[PDB]
Write a structure and sequence with these properties.
heterodimer; A: mainly beta; B: Pdz3 Domain; globular; Disks large homolog 4 (chain B); peptide binding protein; PDZ-peptide ligand complex
Chain lengths: 6, 115
């Protein structure tokens, strides 16, 4: 479920 | 002319020089070794400017650090802390990716289509 901007 | 050519499925090396700015993409995955996938690439960001990453690419490694089995948070930390020059090994895995995104599927050329 997580989404991370990098 | 291009859109019918198969997207290559072999691993590639991508080198992004981003100084102390973000890479300009988002990741999904990381649960129980499912893999880390590019889900979104920001228009005009370093990943876009590379021309060598796309949605549905798996990140296999960053600076020689193997991320095939990484957790979501430790993947994100590896990426954000990789340093100014970021060497990614990526491999296009649209079937695996398509399981994350609603109403998505893979066509005959390997392209991810969302209905």
């Amino acid at each position: 479920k997580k989404e991370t901007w990098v | 002319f291009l859109g019918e050519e198969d997207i290559p499925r072999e691993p590639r090396r991508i080198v992004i020089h981003r100084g102390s700015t973000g890479l300009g993409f988002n990741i999904v995955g990381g649960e129980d070794g499912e893999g880390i996938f590019i889900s979104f690439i920001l228009a005009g960001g370093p990943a876009d400017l590379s021309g060598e990453l796309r949605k549905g690419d798996q990140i296999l490694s960053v600076n020689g650090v193997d991320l095939r089995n990484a957790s979501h948070e430790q993947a994100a930390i590896a990426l954000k802390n990789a340093g100014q020059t970021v060497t990614i090994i990526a491999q296009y895995k649209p079937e695996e990716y398509s399981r994350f995104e609603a109403n998505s599927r893979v066509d005959s050329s390997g392209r991810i289509v969302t209905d």
